[PDB]
A paper describes a structure:
To explore the impact of ACE2 binding on the Omicron spike, we mixed soluble Omicron spike trimer with monomeric hACE2 at a 1:4 molar ratio and incubated it overnight at 4 °C. Excessive hACE2 was removed by consecutive diluting with 20 mM Tris (pH 8.0) and 150 mM NaCl and concentrating using a centrifugal concentrator. Single-particle cryo-EM data were then collected, and the atomic structure of the hACE2-bound Omicron spike was determined. The Omicron spike in complex with hACE2 preferentially adopts the one-RBD-up open state with a prevalence of 95% compared to the two-RBD-up conformation at a 5% ratio, which is significantly different from the prototype and other VOCs. The Omicron spike preferentially adopts the one-RBD-up conformation both before and after ACE2 binding, which is in sharp contrast to the orchestrated conformational changes to create more up-RBDs upon ACE2 binding as observed in the prototype and other four variants of concern (VOCs). Superimposition of one-RBD-up conformation of the spike-hACE2 complex and apo spike of Omicron revealed that the one-RBD-up state has no apparent conformational changes after ACE2 binding. The interface of the down- and up-RBDs is near the ACE2-binding region and well maintained after ACE2 binding. The fact that both apo and ACE2-bound Omicron spikes preferentially adopt the one-RBD-up conformation suggests that the conformational change from down- to up-RBDs of Omicron may require more energy than the prototype, whose spike preferentially adopts the two- and three-RBD-up conformations after binding the ACE2 receptor. Furthermore, our group resolved the cryo-EM structure of the mouse ACE2-bound Omicron spike, which also adopts the one-RBD-up conformation. These results indicate that the conformational changes from the down-RBD to the up-RBD of Omicron may be reduced, even adding the ACE2 receptor.
Residue numbers in the entry:
A (entry chain A): 727 to 827, 848 to 1064
B (entry chain C): 920 to 1147
C (entry chain C): 631 to 676, 690 to 726
């Protein structure tokens, strides 16, 4: 599920005028378009961080797994943090980060910049590790108040009762269930590593933002009916009586293009906000509890879920 | 009953002070009002923009120039003002979509939290849902959610099953706990120990297949009566 | 428009979001008010403006064991607002 979108800022004067001062003087006479555009872009930028906070910052405390990792035969090695690597990420998280990926300088020189996020990747990884530690050591008790310890097989017995199956089914089939779980996690890792089209949604978000920026950059090569696409040659080749028409027409074209960019960004931000709200709901009801809703947290009778972080999104293992 | 009533009354008493003291608790509705006011004020202020014309007032333009030039000036002004109106309408449509999403969420919340009891986690409050009450606010709704939160927890030693007379016993609806010396069965959300009997346990198989089983005794209610 | 803040007195900090002049870095970690970026954010307290890395929350460790359980003995009724 995608959660956040790239934060962008646009400079009016450097995009529309560039290195011309008289163009700026004329641009002062066309109202407060720039205040509106800057305000809208800032609103989107703040909303992105709000989305990330809503999805991930749900636990008050940062829990830690015990030094001895024995959980009744369940392994959990492929999802818990790895202390060897400096990034402190699980193997699945490493594959997810490595699977999703002069143009930047060209965009920057035209006034289009990208702002950094408030939460770094390490902090999101820490939040996911806290959630995993809580759900392994406590169950669903850490989402409704204080965290209370309970052995993992007893937690699985409770979750079996939650779907209409008695406890003896788990207690007399512990090794088989543990082996099935371990094999399933291994197959998930292998399938994620093999197929490269599983991460299509986040890549689509990134590509769409990049394409919008490229279109905005390429709109500066249009004439809009004037005599040239460069301001200096218009001002150096005509008298002020007649240069005004050409400059006005170029300015109107560029303002319209940038307005279209802002509108498209607003619509995309609305869609991403819907996705982030769904992700937060899934984190609340599939990770912090057990869900009776059909097909909400996977295909079958829900037992539990585990979160992982991916570039601009979340991955749930159900 | 009395303690629960006192706690509820204290919470309802404190909620008014919590709303009053903090001046940013109602920020969403104020944001809605401010956004509308800002949009309208900006649309009003756009009327003073020259947009490349000699002046922003139409009467002087008509009174000072010939039709060939008055035409181009007023065409510039008309184009600018129509662009402003179209921008306003588009922004209003987007905000209307956002408000519709919020209203649908509010309707779902009033149907599921107020008209019933919800088992969805973190949907009608933080904790275990009991009930909810609606209140009306300018351009919105305020839900008061009542919630049960555990407190004053204690450690115990547990066991998956109890083996007695070569049989394995499991609790029907509770959990087996021990205070060091004796074993009891208690409900999972509130500590209330009870004696392990046949009424509150059920048997399934022999006790050499379950890991962690504990030897103890199960008290049959029938034998003392038939022995007396 | 001719208001440059030179150096030293306001200090200079190099963050991933840019250059910060006017705030002093501290090694503590607090729940912050004014977000700057890249996990660095600022506040007002000493007397001056200070920048720091935000703290996600208090560290907690649950005593997990093969045969250890925790059971509540009391409850609390809570009333919460949603607007
Ligand atoms: C009870 O827990 C202990 C650990 O606290 C288990 O003993 C082993 O501890 C080592 C620690 O280095 C782990 O690597 C092993 O996985 C643990 N298990 C085994 C079988 O070696 C002990 O097994 C637990 N009790 C039961 C009945 O499983
Ligand atoms: C949990 O699974 C990991 C594999 O993901 C196990 O680590 C493997 O152990 C075998 C030993 O037979 C080695 O041959 C592999 O090279 C190991 N793989 C990795 C990635 O380290 C690990 O042993 C499992 N946990 C337990 C307690 O056995
Ligand atoms: C249940 O037992 C655990 C471990 O025996 C207790 O956790 C310890 O609490 C003391 C505080 O008195 C700390 O100094 C220790 O560092 C804690 N140990 C661990 C491993 O976290 C826990 O407090 C007990 N529960 C209750 C309600 O007393
Ligand atoms: C565990 O609980 C049992 C049952 O409440 C305790 O046994 C009672 O202890 C009280 C305290 O002195 C005595 O007055 C009763 O006569 C005991 N009853 C029986 C049937 O033995 C026991 O002491 C508790 N153990 C601990 C370590 O607290
Ligand atoms: C629980 O009780 C069973 C049976 O009363 C115990 O199993 C016996 O253990 C003794 C060792 O002292 C052996 O000599 C016997 O062969 C075992 N079987 C039987 C049928 O007596 C068991 O050790 C006790 N404890 C646990 C933890 O199970
Ligand atoms: C459960 O908690 C309640 C309060 O949440 C406790 O009641 C308090 O008891 C103390 C000591 O007797 C009094 O000073 C307070 O005035 C009581 N509060 C209220 C609201 O009446 C109650 O004693 C606790 N129960 C247990 C078994 O610990």
């Amino acid at each position: 599920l995608p959660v956040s979108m790239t934060k962008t800022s646009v400079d009016c004067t450097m995009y529309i005028c560039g290195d011309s001062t008289e163009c700026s003087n004329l641009l002062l006479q066309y109202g407060s378009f720039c205040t509106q555009l800057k305000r809208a872009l800032t609103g989107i930028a703040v909303e992105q961080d709000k989305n990330t906070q809503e999805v991930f910052a749900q636990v008050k405390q940062i829990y830690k797994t015990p030094p001895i990792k024995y959980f009744g035969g369940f392994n959990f090695s492929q999802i818990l943090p790895d202390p060897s690597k400096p990034s402190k990420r699980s193997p699945i998280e490493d594959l997810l980060f490595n699977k999703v990926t002069d143009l930047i300088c060209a965009q920057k020189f035209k006034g289009l910049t990208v702002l950094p996020p408030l939460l770094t990747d390490e902090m999101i990884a820490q939040y996911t590790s806290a959630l995993l530690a809580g759900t392994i050591t406590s169950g669903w008790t850490f989402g409704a108040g204080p965290a209370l310890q309970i052995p993992f097989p007893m937690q699985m017995a409770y979750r079996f009762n939650g779907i209409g199956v008695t406890q003896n089914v788990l207690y007399e089939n512990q090794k088989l269930i543990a082996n099935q779980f371990n094999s399933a996690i291994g197959k998930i890792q292998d399938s994620l590593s093999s197929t490269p089209s599983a991460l299509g949604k986040l890549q689509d978000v990134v590509n769409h933002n990049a394409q919008a920026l490229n279109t905005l950059v390429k709109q500066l090569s249009s004439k809009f009916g004037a005599i040239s696409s460069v301001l200096n040659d218009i001002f150096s080749r005509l008298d002020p009586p007649e240069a005004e028409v050409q400059i006005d027409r170029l300015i109107t074209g560029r303002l319209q293009s940038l307005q279209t960019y802002v509108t498209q960004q607003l619509i995309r931000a609305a869609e991403i906000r819907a996705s982030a709200n769904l992700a937060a709901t899934k984190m609340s009801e599939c990770v912090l509890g057990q869900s009776k809703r059909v097909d909400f947290c996977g295909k079958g009778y829900h037992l539990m879920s585990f979160p992982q972080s991916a570039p601009h999104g979340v991955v749930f293992l159900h | 009953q009395k303690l629960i009533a006192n706690q509820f009354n204290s919470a309802i008493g404190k909620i008014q002070d919590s709303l009053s003291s903090t001046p940013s608790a109602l920020g969403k509705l104020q944001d809605v009002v401010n956004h509308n006011a800002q949009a309208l004020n900006t649309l009003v202020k756009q009327l003073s923009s020259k947009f490349g014309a000699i002046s922003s007032v139409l009467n002087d333009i008509f009174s000072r120039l010939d039709p060939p030039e008055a035409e181009v000036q007023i065409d510039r002004l008309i184009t600018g003002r129509l662009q402003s109106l179209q921008t306003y309408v588009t922004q209003q449509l987007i905000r209307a979509a956002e408000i519709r999403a919020s209203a649908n969420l509010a309707a779902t919340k009033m149907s599921e939290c107020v008209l019933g009891q919800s088992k969805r986690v973190d949907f009608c409050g933080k904790g275990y849902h009991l009930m909810s009450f609606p209140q009306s606010a300018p351009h919105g709704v305020v839900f008061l959610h009542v919630t049960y939160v555990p407190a004053q927890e204690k450690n115990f030693t547990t066991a998956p099953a109890i083996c007695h007379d070569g049989k394995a016993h499991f609790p029907r609806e509770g959990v087996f706990v021990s205070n060091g010396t004796h074993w009891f069965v208690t409900q999972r959300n509130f500590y209330e120990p009870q004696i392990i009997t046949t009424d509150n346990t059920f048997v399934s198989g022999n006790c050499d297949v379950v890991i962690g089983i504990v030897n103890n005794t199960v008290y049959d209610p029938l034998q003392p009566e038939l022995d007396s | 428009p001719t208001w440059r803040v030179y150096s030293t007195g306001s200090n200079v900090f190099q963050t991933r979001a840019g250059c910060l002049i006017g705030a002093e870095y501290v090694n503590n970690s607090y729940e912050c008010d004014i977000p700057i970026g890249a996990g660095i954010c600022a506040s007002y307290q000493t007397q001056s403006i200070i920048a720091y890395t935000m703290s996600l929350g208090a560290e907690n460790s649950v005593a997990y064991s093969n045969n250890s359980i925790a059971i509540p003995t009391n409850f609390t009724i809570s009333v919460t607002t949603e607007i």
